[PDB]
Amino acid sequence: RRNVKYRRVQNYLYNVLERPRGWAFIYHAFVFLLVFGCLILSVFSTIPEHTKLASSCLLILEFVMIVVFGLEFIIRIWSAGCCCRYRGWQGRLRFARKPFCVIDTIVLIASIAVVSAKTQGNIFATSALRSLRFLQILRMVRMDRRGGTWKLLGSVVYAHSKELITAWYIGFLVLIFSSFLVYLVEKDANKEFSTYADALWWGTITLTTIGYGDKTPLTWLGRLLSAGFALLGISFFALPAGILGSGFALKVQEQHRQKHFEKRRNPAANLIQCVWRSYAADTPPLKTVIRAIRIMKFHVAKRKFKETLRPYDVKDVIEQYSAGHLDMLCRIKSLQTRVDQILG
Amino acid sequence: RRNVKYRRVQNYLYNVLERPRGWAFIYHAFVFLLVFGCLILSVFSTIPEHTKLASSCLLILEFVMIVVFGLEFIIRIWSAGCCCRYRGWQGRLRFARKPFCVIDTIVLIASIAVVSAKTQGNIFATSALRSLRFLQILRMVRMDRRGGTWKLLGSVVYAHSKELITAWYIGFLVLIFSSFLVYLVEKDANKEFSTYADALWWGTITLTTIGYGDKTPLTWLGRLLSAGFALLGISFFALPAGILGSGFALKVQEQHRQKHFEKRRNPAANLIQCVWRSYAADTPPLKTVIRAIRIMKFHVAKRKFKETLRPYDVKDVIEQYSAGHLDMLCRIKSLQTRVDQILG
Amino acid sequence: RRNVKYRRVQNYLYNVLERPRGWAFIYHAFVFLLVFGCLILSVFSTIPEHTKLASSCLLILEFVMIVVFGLEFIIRIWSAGCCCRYRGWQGRLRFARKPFCVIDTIVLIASIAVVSAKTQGNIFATSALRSLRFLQILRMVRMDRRGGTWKLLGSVVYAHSKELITAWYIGFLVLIFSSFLVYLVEKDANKEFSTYADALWWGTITLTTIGYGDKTPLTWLGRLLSAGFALLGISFFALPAGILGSGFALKVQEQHRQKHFEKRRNPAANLIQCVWRSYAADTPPLKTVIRAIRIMKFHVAKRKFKETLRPYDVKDVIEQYSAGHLDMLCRIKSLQTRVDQILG
Amino acid sequence: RRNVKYRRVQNYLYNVLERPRGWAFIYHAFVFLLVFGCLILSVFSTIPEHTKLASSCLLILEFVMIVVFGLEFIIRIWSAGCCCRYRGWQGRLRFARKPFCVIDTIVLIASIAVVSAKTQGNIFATSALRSLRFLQILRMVRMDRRGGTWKLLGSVVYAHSKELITAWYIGFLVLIFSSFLVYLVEKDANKEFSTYADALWWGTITLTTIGYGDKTPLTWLGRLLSAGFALLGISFFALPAGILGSGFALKVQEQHRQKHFEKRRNPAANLIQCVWRSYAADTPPLKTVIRAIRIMKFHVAKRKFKETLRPYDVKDVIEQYSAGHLDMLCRIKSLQTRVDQILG
Amino acid sequence: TEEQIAEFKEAFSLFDKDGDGTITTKELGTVMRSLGQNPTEAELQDMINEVDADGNGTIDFPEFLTMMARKMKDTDSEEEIREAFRVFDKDGNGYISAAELRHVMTNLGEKLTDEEVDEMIREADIDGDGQVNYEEFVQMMTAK
Amino acid sequence: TEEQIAEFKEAFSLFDKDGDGTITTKELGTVMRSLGQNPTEAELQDMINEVDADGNGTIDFPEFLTMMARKMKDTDSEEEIREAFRVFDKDGNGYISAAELRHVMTNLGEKLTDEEVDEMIREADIDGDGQVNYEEFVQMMTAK
Amino acid sequence: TEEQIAEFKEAFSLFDKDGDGTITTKELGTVMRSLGQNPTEAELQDMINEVDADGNGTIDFPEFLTMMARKMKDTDSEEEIREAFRVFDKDGNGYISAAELRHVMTNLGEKLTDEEVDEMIREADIDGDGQVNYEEFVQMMTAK
Amino acid sequence: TEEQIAEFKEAFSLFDKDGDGTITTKELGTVMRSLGQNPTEAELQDMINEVDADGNGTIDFPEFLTMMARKMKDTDSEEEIREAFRVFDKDGNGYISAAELRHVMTNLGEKLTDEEVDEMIREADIDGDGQVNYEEFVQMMTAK
Ligand SMILES: CCCCCCCC(=O)OC[C@H](COP(=O)(O)O[C@@H]1[C@H](O)[C@H](O)[C@@H](OP(=O)(O)O)[C@H](OP(=O)(O)O)[C@H]1O)OC(=O)CCCCCCC
Ligand SMILES: CCCCCCCC(=O)OC[C@H](COP(=O)(O)O[C@@H]1[C@H](O)[C@H](O)[C@@H](OP(=O)(O)O)[C@H](OP(=O)(O)O)[C@H]1O)OC(=O)CCCCCCC
């Protein structure tokens, strides 16, 4: 009851902290907003004008984050008993060495030191604080789970490596060439295309559609060449964004389709059934043989599930199709042969 | 005849107003053009130069919209009897409380007040009118049906939440880093990268390919770093547009495919058939039993239709495939067994 | 021989002119380059500096295009006998009224008049020539076949109408709002956000990632709001390009898949076979009956081909699948029933 | 042993050089970084300020690349015996005429000449060196295998030729028109829209979202027209990037799917089996007949493999489906007929 | 509802024709075989499955009472019938042709008697360019 | 068209061989069985379905008259035959090989007699690099 | 492990019932037929395939010993069972209903005895909004 | 090539065993049935189809001569065999395992005799981390 309730509160807090879903996302969004506001306030404090009000408002955030994050770390350590592998002093210590948890405590002590030094106000101390302010970004960093963003980005980039490389090479060529030509066309008339480095800077900014406007071609031949190469190189430089975005959309579509037609149901049901059968069986010799059979069934269901880990694709559908076709073929040929024997 | 004709005109006007298709879209486009022209005229009136001609031309639009919208509201209230649930005083009142209808009448009275106060010309009144002019935008707002645009955008964003988040995080990191480096490279040589806030502004504008040109790096190391980080961060910042656009295109493709192979025909035919059978049946006991059977058939067809609400996908095709395969398998195994019995 | 050869040259010239494929594309590209060079030369002649050399070089192009286009029109009129429906004076006249052909002759006489007036050199004449120069663009216009570009663009836009509309509405909202807020934040500090029209111009240019730089926010709150709304509205304003590009790519993919698995072979073979059978048949009564049967077979094959006009989709594959399944089902149930009767 | 080991080292070096995979990519990335750093250093040397330090640092790179590339060429020539077709003096000479190898040696001697002339320091010599520096880019060029980037880009462009052309034409029209209108609206008020060439330059830069800011419309009617045409033409000009990016993503997806469900296994196994059978068979007459049969089986497997070269698509799946359906149909109709005969 | 429950009990007694209290597939099939309908085994299976909610395989008296008590006129049912009619709506203007509807009912699904489809056509106002407002049919068949 | 309608009536009398006035599948099949064609049941079904438009299942005399009156030379039919020929067009230049056409007709679909395909080949100008303009075939078989 | 290996040898002797030393499909099937299980040929095929790793087609004594020695409590096996339970997790909050689990086990796959599913339900804390933490089941069935 | 053509004529005489001059499916099947291979009808069909190029359905002497004259060592054939071997290349480094190759040949396709696969393994240098360069096999089986 009371201890079971305590267990429950701990499980719930563990899910809202480490495995957010629904409202836990609202809490994590609140923490993200707090961290982002801290970063904005620090940036504003960089400005000499607002460094007065911004410093005081940011000081408040220091303690606000400090108190909030200390409370969250206390809850996380007190929680994490959901799996029960971290219960007890040794389990809590094992949890505390989690890379994200060690990072969190390091950011925590850094914030404590920042507040304490702001209290003391030493010169080297205050410089160290101006430097230690960014650490709250590790809170933004810890946000993601095992760097899921980096892994997804890398996966999609690697899948489209040839296209990104092809596209980027072609675009680079375009840039170099256009820069050079304009430079030849404008090396003398325009004082800003004086060196080829200037032309390369203009081409980079031009094709990337930034277009600062510090360097722009003045000669009409230069403007014509710039227009043509602008159309080409702009298409090429915008290409990688389109390739990666389309790849992301296609991967999302594929993941959604696979989720809709996932194969987990029957293997899971069989696995649980035989697992409980073995747990129950764990004459005497007949019961032992049945136990061995049930454990084997559990292992087979585990193997089938591990096979099903592979996402469904054209491979699986065509495989099942061909299997069905071969079964019907062999069975109906056998029926024809049997009926023939009947005729004989 | 005459009253049936009146009923007809009301139905037609209800479809052209609330359920546009074809020419109704041309009328709605006319109303949208009128509202958009009103907004443009108001914006122009904001300008001190054109505030003279624009004020008079806009005054005309006030009344034009006023008269047109009053007429449209009168038609909508007089219409909406297509369903017949809004006929009579109570039905018209029930219709008038529709959120879009209450919004429309509020905009209507606001326009009336604007015209009346322009007639009177009080100082506070005229300030209130300069403020109440935007309301015609609610006409632009009412345009969409139950916020279909917002719902579609939210659906596609949520489907691609991980990619938008991953991409945006990576892009933010890129920005912060590039801003900082350029700042270090140019904090002294360039007077516009004086504070890190200035560098962040430059990075935001640079990676977003806006490129105002107010801040641009001057040192050649700064330009090199800016070029590299420009390529990276530009790809990242343009990513969300590509992801969302591709997701929209894929969702459109999916909707079109599902529409082409929708499953509505047979369940609909069966449903209507059994519904009419029950309506007709509503010896005596045999007729009552047949009525019960027909009502049950209607309910079954309704359930099958509710099932068919789910858009067709790989799930449905593979489901029907597997069902057919199992039927043929069992039937042909039964035939083999039967023939075997014949042999015995 | 000689007249058959003449017929051949005319057919070949008709295909290279009206139905280009391969080298005909190289000739059409040459004509396009000539027209585009004429347009470039006219634009350059607009410039007071280069109006001297450009005028003479362009005059050459006048005659060059003139002579080339007159020759091409002569060839097109002399050709177009490939179908033989335009042979003879009446057929040539019928061809000459083709909208593209009438346009071509109008451009031809316009060019002749331009050259003649350049020879005469009247004031009003020369002004008319400065105006009549653009007509060569109709040559660029005639290029496309029945406005295929416009039809394709309209088709893809209409298919994605909801997404373009949703996206554009959301983006417009973003723009208006961001413009307004910055205006409030900067109406006084910045002299360029003096009126809301100025703020709207800044927002338009900002979100569209043009970023001229004439108006940029100076206050740091203004820059923060501009950055956030820049990220949002930039995604929204770049959305339509991504939606349409993705839609184009998906439609191309679909067209390619349909081409690979087109259903033309068997209906075409049957159609030609029965058509020739009927042409041959066109005892006596038995031959007449066979002729009627063959004409009916030709008409049936024509109907099946008209059905196959519809591009292949999930509909056709699932239709054939279900048909096959029902045939096997009925046949094998019949076999089971037959074997049962044997048992009886 | 020792010579077999030598053979091995040569094979390994040949794969890491010509057929990189894994670590070979890291070596090629190192060489690419070296070449790119050389290009950057040359560009910096173009700048009069950094031409002093950059010249010395670049000189080092000259020799660094020189020594590294000479070593690599020596290894490549010494290697390439993996196939054994280039072993011996004649084989090495045959390898040396490979277009990439001849290009590499030409770049090598060019670098040697650059170093030697830098040693001598002649005026014409040094000018030739300032010109011969770019050659290291051929090292960047040789990087790709048989111009895979160009071939992929051309393939995707050609597949989407109609959409790129349609889109580009529409965009060009938009540009011309918007430029012209603004020009009319601003030919007098604005001194920068003086000629239509200036308006065309503004439109090019505007729609391409470069937005230098040198020319921007000032009149409010001009700004309104610029905003509307900006939205339209921006969508059109950004279209080609989206089309090509989406096409790249779709082609990658297709390629991945085909790789997952490639048909190489069974034909390959049969081919190798019968090839070895024939190699073994190469009474006496019975053995010769078996040899002929095995060689025929090898040739049939080769033909089937050549057929399988064609990437899997809807064509292959539907083909196999229809084949299976026809086999079951004919077999089961035969079974029904046989059972009927039994009844008779 | 004593009259209604008495009628339901009499109907159940007629259905089962015995004191077992459970409705099996065979008896339900015989009920209509008496009228020469020739029910299918799957038809009877779904007939039984639609009344009971426990999966026992038979229709208990409380289950039949629950089935009968609920009213056909429901928001979900009305929407389902409305969309079923809209299946054959052209141009999205909410119009379905009378002759096209007649052909669809005659050919697709359980064929309706020609006279019955004629009454369907006449049950509402069918004139007016040959189109009949399906929502009128929905209102007529949702009134209970 | 008294001669034409008389010929059509005589043809219908030969087809049905009786005064029933309706053409059934069996009689239509027997018409060709007399010539040893061995028609299929589905073949006869589509034969009947193509003349009548009411779905009664038989070919009435007015329906056969309507079928016969219409002229084979039609814009839609001409386009269909043109695209059928274009099916085997290479490079989009409007050329189909004579030998490839012969093989396609011989193997795919209802096999044509070798002599008949030879006449097809000779009916137009087949020389000129071995290609035959299919549009010439379309004009020859659209002249009625 | 002399007791364990002796038990394994006795079990193998019971399984094969002969001195052949190889376990064939027929004998393995008979082992359970003695208990009236009626094994399938494919069932026995996968039974044999899961112990041996050479593909000979029979279960050798060392192969059975290798199968038995390995412990069910494994990281891979624990993860597989955890995901198998998560298959029926709603909202991603790690909760599976007791009644839904009972129905799933009863209907899908090899049906569990009602009493056995009841013990499954009672083996852990089932109360608390009707949901049972599947990870508790994983811990209970991974303890060996 | 008088010796070669004489050998080919003798081989054809042995194949057909008669003066017909055409090789039919039955005789070709009997040729191997004499050795107890039990050929399939489709096997013989593709056997005949691969020699003749006219589709007559039999192997004429000139067709067999054309088949035999061509050399197995061809660029296309060498590339096909190379890619067939690469089918089982891991990491794109051009290495195929000896044991994996043995298993693939034994199980997939027409099973090779264990001794024959052993000779395949020994025909080249198989050591060196257990991988065998498939290109060595290609060179060995492309030398004719
Ligand atoms: C900066 C350079 C960026 C280059 C890209 C980043 C460099 C990089 O290579 O990593 C991406 C990588 C690729 O992912 P990954 O290899 O697992 O992708 C699978 C892989 O291609 C398999 O071989 C495919 O199986 P198969 O053969 O078809 O059968 C499988 O397809 P399928 O079986 O499911 O159907 C693919 O899903 O894994 C990361 O996410 C780490 C992110 C590191 C990113 C760190 C920085 C973000
Ligand atoms: C600003 C933050 C934006 C975040 C995005 C907006 C925040 C947000 O979450 O709302 C989007 C949301 C998602 O839509 P929704 O949940 O219904 O999408 C379905 C959902 O994913 C189902 O679970 C899927 O079923 P299943 O599991 O696969 O079986 C189904 O796939 P399928 O069955 O059909 O195949 C999906 O279609 O619903 C709105 O449109 C409201 C728009 C609110 C937008 C309000 C502002 C525009």
Centre of ligand 2 from the C-alpha of residue D139, in Å: 50
- Which helix (H) or strand (E) segment holds residue F96: the answer is strand F96-97
Q: What secondary structure letter does DSSP report for A134?
A: G
Spacing of C-alpha F119 from chain mean position: 17
Ligand 2 centre and the CA of B310: distance in Å? 15
Nearest C-alpha neighbor of H82 from the set H137, H144, H143: H137
Total number of residues shown for chain A:
344
C-D interface (Cβ pairs under 8 Å ≥ 3): yes
C-alpha torsion D30→D31→D35→D37, nearest 10:
20
User: What CA–CA distances, in Å, run from B261 to B323, C262, C315, C316?
Assistant: 19, 19, 6, 9
Half-sphere exposure of E35 (CA within 13 A, CB side): 15
Residues of chain D with Cβ-Cβ distance to A160 below 8 Å are: 248-249, 252
Quote the domain boundaries for residue F52: 6-69
| Helix extents (H) in F17-97 | 25-33, 41-49, 61-69, 75-86
Mutation for testing the A interface, residue in D212, D246, D337, D341 having most A CBs under 10 Å:
D212
Parallel, antiparallel, or unpaired for β G131-132 and G96-97?
Answer: antiparallel
Query: Using the beta-carbon criterion (under 8 Å), do C276 and F88 form an inter-chain contact?
Result: no
Dihedral-angle region of residue H38 (phi above 0 means left; psi in -120 to 50 means alpha; beta otherwise): left
All chains having 3 or more CB pairs closer than 8 angstroms to chain C: A, B, D, F
Q: Which amino acid is at C16?
A: V
Closest ligand 2 atom to residue B159 Cα is 21
Neighbouring-strand partners of residue F60: F22
Amino acid at B172: F
Binding residues of H for Ca(2+) are 16, 18, 20, 22, 27, 52, 54, 56, 58, 63, 89, 91, 93, 95, 100, 125, 127, 129, 131, 136
For residue C332, give the chain A residue with the closest CA.
A332
For B342, the closest of C240, C328, C343 (CB atoms) is C343
Nearest to E61 by CA among E97, E8, E119: E8
* Of the candidates C63, C91, C74, the residue with the CA atom closest to the CA atom of residue C13: C74
Tokens of C120: 């005469």
DSSP one-letter string for C59-104: HHHHHHHHHHHHHHHHHHHHS--SSSTT-HHHHHHHHHTSHHHHHH
Distance CA E120, CA E97 (A): 13
Residues of C at the annotated binding site?
146, 162, 259
Of B149, B152, B260, which has the smallest distance from its Cβ to C314's Cβ?
B260
The approach used to solve this structure was: cryo-EM
Question: How far from chain centre, in Å, is Cα D144?
Answer: 7
Whether there are 3 or more C-beta pairs closer than 8 Å between A and D is yes
CB H96 within 8 A of CB H134: yes
**Strand, helix or coil for residue A121:** coil
Chain D residue nearest residue B328, CA to CA: D328
Answer for the pair C104, C74: CB distance below 8 angstroms, yes or no. Answer: no
Q: Which atom of ligand 1 is nearest to the CA of A311?
A: 34
B8 CB neighbours in chain E (<8 A) are 128
Distance, CA B316 to ligand 2 centroid (Å)? 21
Which of B40, B47, B49, B212 to mutate to probe the C interface, most C CBs <10 Å? B212
Contacts of B11 by beta carbon, 8 Å cutoff, 6+ apart: B79, B81, B82, E133
The alpha carbon of residue A335 is apart from the nearest alpha carbon of chain C, in Å, by 12
d(CA C233, CA D166): 27
User: How many C-alpha atoms does B152 have within 13 Å on its Cβ side?
Assistant: 25
Q: What is the resolution of this structure in A?
A: 3.1
Cβ(B124) to ligand 2 under 6 A? no
How far apart (Å, rounded) are the C-alpha atoms in residues B182 and B179? 5
Q: Do D170 and C149 touch (CB under 8 A)?
A: yes
* Ligand 1 atom 6: residue of nearest CA: A154
Q: Report the C-alpha gap between F41 and F43 in whole angstroms.
A: 5
Q: Is A148 in the pocket of ligand 1 (CB under 6 A)?
A: no
Token couple for B16:
């052209």
Q: Which two tokens stand for residue D88?
A: 């011996």
Closest partner residue to A243 among D148, D197, D249, by Cβ?
D249
Cα within 13 Å of Cα(H105), Cβ side: 26
Give which of B246, B325, B329 to mutate to test D binding, by max D Cβ within 10 Å.
B246
In chain D, at which residue ranges do the beta strands (DSSP E only) sit? none
* DSSP states along A67-117: HHHHHHHHHHHHS--SSSTT-HHHHHHHHHTSHHHHHHHHHHHHHHHHHHH
> Using CB atoms, which residue from D214, D245, D256 is nearest to A216?
D214
Return the residue matching tokens 């014409």.
D124
Task: Using CB atoms, list chains with 3+ pairs below 8 Å to chain D.
Answer: A, B, C, H
- Is the sign of the CA dihedral B312, B315, B316, B321 positive or negative? positive
For residue F97, what is the DSSP state?
E
Report chain H residues whose CB lies below 8 A from the CB of D269: 104-105, 108-110
- Give the ligand whose atoms come closest to the C-alpha of residue D25: 1
Produce one character per residue of A81-92: b if its CB has 16 or more CB atoms within 10 Å, e if not: bbeeebeeeeee
Residues of F in contact with C8 (CB under 8 A): 128
Q: Is B105 helix (H, G, I), strand (E, B) or coil?
A: helix
B154 lines ligand 2 (CB under 6 A): yes
Q: Nearest CB to B213: which of D49, D213, D245?
A: D213
Task: Determine if residue C310 is left, alpha or beta; phi over 0 gives left, psi from -120 to 50 gives alpha, anything else beta.
Answer: beta
Which domains, ranges and CATH numbers included, belong to chain D?
A: 2-143 (1.20.120), 158-260 (1.10.287.70), 265-343 (no CATH)
Question: In 10 A of CB B71, how many CB atoms?
Answer: 10
The answer, yes or no, to whether any atom of ligand 1 lies below 6 A from the CB of A165, is: no
Please list, in sequence order, all residues whose beta carbon lies within 8 angstroms of the beta carbon of residue B61, skipping any fewer than 6 positions away: B34, B37, B38, B41
Residues on chain C touching B256 (C-beta within 8 angstroms): 159
- For residue B159, the ligand closest to its alpha carbon is 2
Antiparallel, parallel or unpaired: β E96-97 and E131-132: antiparallel
Query: What does DSSP assign to residue D22?
Result: T
Choose from E81, E88, E116, E129 for mutation: most chain B CBs within 10 A. Answer: E81
CATH number of the domain where residue E22 is located: 1.10.238.10
E97 strand-pairing partners: E131
Q: How many CB atoms lie within 10 A of CB E76?
A: 10
